[PDB]
Enzyme design. Sequence first.
Site, PDB file in Angstrom:
ATOM      1  N   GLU A 182      27.913  20.211  50.949  1.00 29.22           N
ATOM      2  CA  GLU A 182      26.665  20.860  51.326  1.00 29.22           C
ATOM      3  C   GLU A 182      25.484  19.894  51.288  1.00 29.22           C
ATOM      4  O   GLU A 182      25.309  19.141  50.328  1.00 29.22           O
ATOM      5  CB  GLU A 182      26.398  22.023  50.365  1.00 29.22           C
ATOM      6  CG  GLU A 182      25.081  22.727  50.587  1.00 29.22           C
ATOM      7  CD  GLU A 182      24.753  23.758  49.511  1.00 29.22           C
ATOM      8  OE1 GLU A 182      25.537  23.905  48.538  1.00 29.22           O
ATOM      9  OE2 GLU A 182      23.690  24.417  49.644  1.00 29.22           O
ATOM     10  N   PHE A 183      24.630  19.967  52.311  1.00 28.91           N
ATOM     11  CA  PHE A 183      23.372  19.227  52.332  1.00 28.91           C
ATOM     12  C   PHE A 183      22.269  20.056  51.679  1.00 28.91           C
ATOM     13  O   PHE A 183      22.041  21.211  52.065  1.00 28.91           O
ATOM     14  CB  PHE A 183      22.955  18.860  53.761  1.00 28.91           C
ATOM     15  CG  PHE A 183      21.725  17.996  53.813  1.00 28.91           C
ATOM     16  CD1 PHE A 183      20.452  18.567  53.798  1.00 28.91           C
ATOM     17  CD2 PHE A 183      21.834  16.608  53.825  1.00 28.91           C
ATOM     18  CE1 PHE A 183      19.309  17.767  53.795  1.00 28.91           C
ATOM     19  CE2 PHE A 183      20.695  15.791  53.835  1.00 28.91           C
ATOM     20  CZ  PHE A 183      19.432  16.368  53.818  1.00 28.91           C
ATOM     21  N   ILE A 184      21.570  19.453  50.710  1.00 28.37           N
ATOM     22  CA  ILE A 184      20.486  20.107  49.986  1.00 28.37           C
ATOM     23  C   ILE A 184      19.213  19.294  50.169  1.00 28.37           C
ATOM     24  O   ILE A 184      19.228  18.060  50.112  1.00 28.37           O
ATOM     25  CB  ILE A 184      20.798  20.282  48.484  1.00 28.37           C
ATOM     26  CG1 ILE A 184      22.081  21.083  48.294  1.00 28.37           C
ATOM     27  CG2 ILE A 184      19.650  20.994  47.770  1.00 28.37           C
ATOM     28  CD1 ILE A 184      22.364  21.428  46.852  1.00 28.37           C
ATOM     29  N   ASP A 223      28.171  12.731  33.092  1.00 26.14           N
ATOM     30  CA  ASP A 223      27.425  11.514  33.414  1.00 26.14           C
ATOM     31  C   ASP A 223      25.987  11.858  33.783  1.00 26.14           C
ATOM     32  O   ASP A 223      25.541  11.554  34.894  1.00 26.14           O
ATOM     33  CB  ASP A 223      28.089  10.736  34.572  1.00 26.14           C
ATOM     34  CG  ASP A 223      27.457   9.334  34.796  1.00 26.14           C
ATOM     35  OD1 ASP A 223      26.902   8.730  33.837  1.00 26.14           O
ATOM     36  OD2 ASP A 223      27.494   8.838  35.942  1.00 26.14           O
TER      37      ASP A 223
HETATM   38  N1  LIG Z   1      24.324  17.115  48.399  1.00 26.47           N
HETATM   39  C1  LIG Z   1      23.365  16.302  48.890  1.00 26.47           C
HETATM   40  N2  LIG Z   1      22.521  16.693  49.868  1.00 26.47           N
HETATM   41  C2  LIG Z   1      21.562  15.894  50.364  1.00 26.47           C
HETATM   42  N3  LIG Z   1      21.362  14.649  49.916  1.00 26.47           N
HETATM   43  C3  LIG Z   1      22.130  14.138  48.931  1.00 26.47           C
HETATM   44  C4  LIG Z   1      23.196  14.950  48.347  1.00 26.47           C
HETATM   45  N4  LIG Z   1      23.801  14.207  47.401  1.00 26.47           N
HETATM   46  C5  LIG Z   1      23.174  13.011  47.378  1.00 26.47           C
HETATM   47  N5  LIG Z   1      22.179  12.982  48.286  1.00 26.47           N
HETATM   48  C6  LIG Z   1      21.320  11.825  48.583  1.00 26.47           C
HETATM   49  O1  LIG Z   1      22.211  10.771  48.999  1.00 26.47           O
HETATM   50  C7  LIG Z   1      21.785   9.513  48.475  1.00 26.47           C
HETATM   51  C8  LIG Z   1      22.874   8.868  47.605  1.00 26.47           C
HETATM   52  O2  LIG Z   1      23.365   9.874  46.737  1.00 26.47           O
HETATM   53  P1  LIG Z   1      24.087   9.616  45.333  1.00 26.47           P
HETATM   54  O3  LIG Z   1      24.337  10.971  44.740  1.00 26.47           O
HETATM   55  O4  LIG Z   1      23.340   8.544  44.565  1.00 26.47           O
HETATM   56  O5  LIG Z   1      25.510   9.068  45.849  1.00 26.47           O
HETATM   57  P2  LIG Z   1      26.225   7.734  45.292  1.00 26.47           P
HETATM   58  O6  LIG Z   1      25.834   7.670  43.832  1.00 26.47           O
HETATM   59  O7  LIG Z   1      27.699   7.964  45.535  1.00 26.47           O
HETATM   60  O8  LIG Z   1      25.649   6.625  46.137  1.00 26.47           O
HETATM   61  C9  LIG Z   1      20.515   9.828  47.707  1.00 26.47           C
HETATM   62  O9  LIG Z   1      19.448   9.592  48.626  1.00 26.47           O
HETATM   63  C10 LIG Z   1      20.542  11.305  47.408  1.00 26.47           C
HETATM   64  O10 LIG Z   1      19.232  11.847  47.489  1.00 26.47           O
END
Ligand SMILES: Nc1ncnc2c1ncn2[C@@H]1O[C@H](COP(=O)(O)OP(=O)(O)O)[C@@H](O)[C@H]1O
EC number: 2.7.1.172
Lengths: 289, 289
Positions: free
Chosen positions: A90-92, A195
């Site tokens: 899901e995109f949030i 975490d």
């Molecule tokens: N479910 C989500 N919906 C929209 N944006 C997300 C979502 N999960 C992460 N992001 C965005 O994606 C980028 C990287 O996410 P992150 O959770 O740090 O992934 P990783 O640690 O695997 O690189 C960040 O800009 C974060 O705001």
Amino acid sequence: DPIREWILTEGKATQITKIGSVGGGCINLASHYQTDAGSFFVKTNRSIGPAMFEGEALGLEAMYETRTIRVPNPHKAGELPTGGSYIIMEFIDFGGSRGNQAELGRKLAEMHKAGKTSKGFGFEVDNTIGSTPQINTWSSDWIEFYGEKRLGYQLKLARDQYGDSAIYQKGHTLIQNMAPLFENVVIEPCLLHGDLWSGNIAYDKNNEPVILDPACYYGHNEADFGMSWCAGFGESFYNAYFKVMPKQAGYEKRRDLYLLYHYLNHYNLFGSGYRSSAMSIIDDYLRML
Amino acid sequence: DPIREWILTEGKATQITKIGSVGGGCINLASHYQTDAGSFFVKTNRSIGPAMFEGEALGLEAMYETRTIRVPNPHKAGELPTGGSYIIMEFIDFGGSRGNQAELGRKLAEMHKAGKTSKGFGFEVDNTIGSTPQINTWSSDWIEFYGEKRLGYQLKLARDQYGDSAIYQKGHTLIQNMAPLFENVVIEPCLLHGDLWSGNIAYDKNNEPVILDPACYYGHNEADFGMSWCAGFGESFYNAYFKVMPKQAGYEKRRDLYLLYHYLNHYNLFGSGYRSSAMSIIDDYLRML
Ligand SMILES: Nc1ncnc2c1ncn2[C@@H]1O[C@H](COP(=O)(O)OP(=O)(O)O)[C@@H](O)[C@H]1O
Ligand SMILES: Nc1ncnc2c1ncn2[C@@H]1O[C@H](COP(=O)(O)OP(=O)(O)O)[C@@H](O)[C@H]1O
Ligand SMILES: [Cl-]
Ligand SMILES: [Cl-]
């Protein structure tokens, strides 16, 4: 080879006898997919096999089902045919301007309280904390689980990576003399995020908390504060937390014990600059005990 | 292509209109070179041009020459003929047994005190904070330098990456009303590390502090605490610091203003989960003013 070139002219050397290398991994690609049916959030990594994204998907799924703190609904994880792995969720829309530290503590405590298991301490699959494997084989005693599959695994891993037999021996003295730190309290398995620091927390448009990138398992609820040194948790966070999950005897005495797992992990992942933090904690408990 | 496949199988979509991607870089390879003339520490990155390592080398050199807090002596930075860049520096054996906070505060305050410049606020070259450019054009007024080349640069970047015109407008309102936070105090340029958190701090064999990976410039000494939310600074840290350096009026009032620069940078680097921390700080100051 300009590195070799400098070392053999200016560095005053004539031969290079050993090269040891760490690091070099590639970071996840994070993507927003725009479609006529709304957005989707996707993360890919061409270098890593699918186990990591699969553990994330199952972690997000187990926290989603408690129906307490908001997490992205996971859709699919798997292998890329080109090589590598992906996850779809899901995109949030993040960026709630106000934020709510007490709401985070309340909603997190509701997740610890609602997330239950009949199988004891552990998880259905092994997953990872950062890149390090996190062993999740079911066990019925928390002191047994945490000493062996948490502290013990990390200590053995540091002995193999760095020949650090000193931390391995002093650590295992601690593991063996650990019980008085628990003061005979009864410990119920709780679904942990595993975490929880600033990079994994966000706020949506209703200024409600959202947590991401889990390393889930069922454990002592207090272990979810083990990353607090990079979280900025205030008194309003803890007091809202303890309103739902009251503070148990020995809570203050054990805080370092749960930081120690993540300090060992950071040592094992990011280098010996973290070794003093871990060793400092182990020394104090040996003194105190 | 399971991503496109799933989005049209179970995602119920028929056209993908855009895909926006961040991340995906590769991290540095870190190497221990053993030679007949002793050890060297080397970092390489095959993807990046030499500007980042060159800024690191000049930062180390400046801190090294103050002869206060221990830093690795830098030797050479440059470009790899295959593509990418490298840096060569002194190898230091980390792993202090207890670790030493008060000594970290002492030595850091001494570096602020010893590191001086006749050119005002700024640095000899532009460098980077993380991967973000850090503009270091010499200025003689601190309120002006910090408002334009720190906060203002980060706000413009945030407006361009995210269409976040709200943070940009509230941000420039704060910048224009900033002076009362400074209570007319005179500000002396101090050599700053610029990115001081746990991952950049280590302890050597004598349990003396060593600091790494700078983003240096000459600025207000209080701005070096802007990463403290991930630093674990104890009370013994601040007690030793303020023994060397006199605390100036408005110190408590300005702490969030210096956190804010790093919250904006983290927003720009790691995503909108960090936007709420930045906005909350900007909102409080607009109220307070
Ligand atoms: N479910 C989500 N919906 C929209 N944006 C997300 C979502 N999960 C992460 N992001 C965005 O994606 C980028 C990287 O996410 P992150 O959770 O740090 O992934 P990783 O640690 O695997 O690189 C960040 O800009 C974060 O705001
Ligand atoms: N001058 C040095 N001497 C010895 N080891 C170092 C030195 N600088 C860094 N390291 C080690 O190298 C690894 C990564 O270095 P780090 O400073 O994190 O570089 P980067 O920021 O590019 O990842 C860690 O294991 C760290 O302990
Ligand atoms: Cl971290
Ligand atoms: Cl960080």
